[PDB]
Design an enzyme around this catalytic site. Structure first.
Site, PDB file in Angstrom:
ATOM      1  N   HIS A  97     -48.275 -24.711  54.313  1.00 13.42           N
ATOM      2  CA  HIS A  97     -48.388 -25.096  52.872  1.00 13.42           C
ATOM      3  C   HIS A  97     -49.314 -24.501  52.111  1.00 13.42           C
ATOM      4  CE1 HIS A  97     -46.672 -27.657  49.514  1.00 13.42           C
ATOM      5  NE2 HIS A  97     -46.172 -28.467  50.058  1.00 13.42           N
ATOM      6  N   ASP A 155     -45.069 -23.090  48.619  1.00 16.24           N
ATOM      7  CA  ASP A 155     -44.928 -24.419  48.148  1.00 16.24           C
ATOM      8  C   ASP A 155     -43.364 -24.984  48.296  1.00 16.24           C
ATOM      9  OD1 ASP A 155     -43.297 -23.539  45.948  1.00 16.24           O
ATOM     10  OD2 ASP A 155     -45.168 -23.391  44.514  1.00 16.24           O
TER      11      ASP A 155
END
Lengths: 224, 224, 224, 224
Positions: free
Chosen positions: C195, C199
């Site tokens: 992450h 995204d």
């Protein structure tokens, strides 16, 4: 990627060029129902598997040519020479290209004999053992492009013949029988003819007789 | 009512005369079910409306030519010159007559790119802005007379090419699927070929491969 | 029962520890209908049986990665290095443990070529003949735990990659199609991603594109 | 292709790294029937279209947090600090990346007010006008990856919060109602929680209460 043209390919090209420049062609096609043709092939599988739908079509073509002699002829520079012998050329696809073996005196062969000679010629074409006599002298030629998947086609006349018959692919297609739309195995036959020799009425009589023989093979017994 | 032949019309006539005298042609046709072709066009309407049934047919033709290289070739007076580049000519009807724009290096274009170049060439043909380079150098030509309402046809080979593909009109017609008569959008494809270069087995392999790609476009992924 | 950790097992443990301490992961899953995927596999059985549902999924994954380049990347201590080459690692269960062979330059392979290379790598993994080059350098990894019966799973990212894709078991499950509950072969895809690099919007775009390609493989032709 | 990490992307990466190293997470998911949720959204379209399924889910989440206070808390190095204010962070995908705007004092907002503030924050995130106060101070965060097409997911806790709620895609799926298999709009909710703060019984009570509120929104009137 330059590929010099030799042997079997060169023979094909010279023959195609000669036919193209000399013959004013026309074409006529008829749709033929093949249900009875395939049922008859099925009856012969046990005793004579060489009798394929192609061999049966050729046997019935020999009957039609006996009754439509102008289709088995040559334009001579003017006269038309009608040949009594039916020497049937047919296309045989090989690894080296197209060979056109010839069944000599096909008019004297019964169904089993014609199918046996066709099988011998196909074997010879594949193995490269055909003699020059087995590759010349045809008076009428057949192109079974239908066995290769082509639905309908227009082949080139084998000079100096007056006509060639193309046999489209036999497969189920919709047709009207007794006012109802039904599925039947069918094929389109296409005759390409030298219009100096054969007129439309002559080609139509020939194609309708051949269609009717294929559609009801037992009618071939009339003059046999 | 005498109409002197000039410009676009004169170019068409000179090209037709040259092809006629030189090439011994034969023709082969296959019937193609277009249900999946139109469903795929529908999937692309939102993102790429330039991808019409014609553009999809051309993309699948490029795959078939990659696997049947003899169809994209020229007879040279004897040798056959097989072209690695696929420069696709296609007929575009204009107010001044027939123009045959060419998609150069079509073998290197993906579906979206090919459809975009076809749209540019059609715009240029209509507006009279095509350059001489955009109107020459084709190695294979397509005639979409089906878009004009013709069910089946026989176009003239674009000399010195070995073949031209005619695309009949796509519309609902009866066919047999799984033994049942059903309605499907279909079209008849007709390949007119130089029989000195291409034989019947070669044209049949090419047409059957192209039919199978159109009928099930997802099978094009095999070598993509 | 003490079992010292060596070779293939030791390599697996060191790699798992490194990935665990360094990467902040998140997961996203999508349910995918596999009816068309299996029908396409069936079409290829005769000519190319190496093209399995796994090989087809990998080919479609390569398309999705071409359009979602951030998924094929590495976090560098800060920068993101986006890799142009797609070197696809995939888990291969062996008698000695897990090997992760790599298809180098998967972006340049067509379906048949990719399936052939996958089959070679599976053979090499089973026979213990893979070279060190064939076991390193991946930019994206796939874990086909579905072939082992797992319905859904969460694999560990192959450090220093940005993502791994888990492929759940393909089997019939209920889904709603056109408002009706029906049975379809389906699978759950799970993407585990770094992450810091990717995204949620990026992973969702990638997974939805890959789902749509699998559900309708003919749509892959858009940019091919 | 090297991309230096800056601004919004850099903030996301630093936050993800901090959460990963510090929080021992566990996950719990519940499937929720959304038929009544969408019917209620339909009732509000005319007077208050800002009241989307997401805004309704957030309003019902605020009720569940009022009755499950341990979910809106922080681990402090040991003590648990339970927050009376519910400052709701939510992911908003922008062209520059992920922003997590915060609805301050969400516990004091009615449905219309909460939906209006969410719409303002989404507008501000898209236009780049959010202040630093509007991007910090959350006590609980929601990730609506379902709006992006993800069926189920596992987001990362927004440190130093004790939990994050992921909202899977709302779409028709098969479920059993009264012993019959039927189609209903559904979604999977996934709570990722700091297992030092919240235990499984606490997360299950919270998720079951929130599922029951969504499934029958009129039950929210009990303490309103």
């Amino acid at each position: 990627d330059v590929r010099p043209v030799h042997g079997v390919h060169a023979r094909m090209a010279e023959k195609m060029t000669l036919s193209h420049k000399e013959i004013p062609t026309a074409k006529a096609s008829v749709e033929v129902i093949c249900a009875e043709l395939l049922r008859l092939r099925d009856r012969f599988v046990s005793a004579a598997p060489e009798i394929t739908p192609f061999a049966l079509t050729l046997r019935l073509l020999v009957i039609a040519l006996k009754h439509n002699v102008i289709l088995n002829s040559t334009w001579v520079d003017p006269q038309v020479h009608v040949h009594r012998g039916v020497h049937l050329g047919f296309g045989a696809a090989t690894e080296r290209g197209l060979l056109v073996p010839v069944v000599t005196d096909a008019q004297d062969k019964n169904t089993r004999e014609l199918a046996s000679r066709v099988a011998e010629l196909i074997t010879g074409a594949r193995e490269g053992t055909l003699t020059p006599a087995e590759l010349r002298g045809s008076t009428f030629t057949v192109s079974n492009f239908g066995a290769l998947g082509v639905d309908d086609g227009v082949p080139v006349i084998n000079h100096p013949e007056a006509a060639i018959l193309g046999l489209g692919a036999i497969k189920p297609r919709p047709v009207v029988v007794g006012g109802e739309v039904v599925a039947r195995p069918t094929m389109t036959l296409t005759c390409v003819f030298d219009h100096r020799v054969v007129d439309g009425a002559q080609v139509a009589q020939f194609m309708c007789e051949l269609r009717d023989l294929i559609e009801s093979p037992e009618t071939a017994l009339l003059d046999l």
